[PDB]
Amino acid sequence: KVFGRCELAAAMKRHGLDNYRGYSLGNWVCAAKFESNFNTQATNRNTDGSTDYGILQINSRWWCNDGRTPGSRNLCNIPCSALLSSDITASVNCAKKIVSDGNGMNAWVAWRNRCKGTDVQAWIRGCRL
Template identity: 50%
Template sequence: GMKAAGIFALIGCLVTSTESKLYTRCKLAQIFARAGLDNYAGFSLGNWICMAYYESGYNTTAETILEDGSIDYGIFQINSYTWCRYAKLQEKNHCHVACSALVTDDLTDAIICAKKIVKETQGMNYWQGWKKHCEGKDLSEWKKGCDV
């Protein structure tokens, strides 16, 4: 069963400020499907929706500062140290993108980067939220009632 259904209903009703975009589950499902995430690298759409929920609560502007000083950005909480460019610090920037591009309403850059992470790190284990809450579970509920 899925206790989270009530939480989703709540999230859908939240009025958000202009700076921060909080997508609904079904809107994200549509965006993810259009971007080719369904079964990308063998991961069903439910995996992506579940992961985004547990990483950011679907908040495109989420930023988390970690103990090592790096920052996790956006809907997928992508880390600055390896994956994006923060200010003048090049670090590794494997996604060839500014970290600021990962916290906009347009999810294109975040999705391209997430695809790269999945390909380069062998799957979705990069995301602790996915490992803990989504891996090996029946994830069909996550796109239930959505037009995808």
């Protein structure tokens, strides 16, 4: 599923992501924009052989099981496929664990490089929330 901007903001809010760990909703929307272009089926292979999955490009090295990342963990206790669903519940639940892991949203390198410090409220501008 390819979400609209405000559609995704609303789904993230429903699932309690807004201001989770102090990160306003526009931070999450901006991160999704640059990680997946709002496409739940986004995947991207890393050089190390891990894969990133879904709207927030969550990595199999630590967070989900795909059966093909040797030595990896599955800290969200989910198949990485669950991260590609139209329903974002698994992605949001796992994102909450990632953002609580110590480095905040810096776990998402695209958020650090393209969202951090910017006018992230623009991402929820105009949205009926």
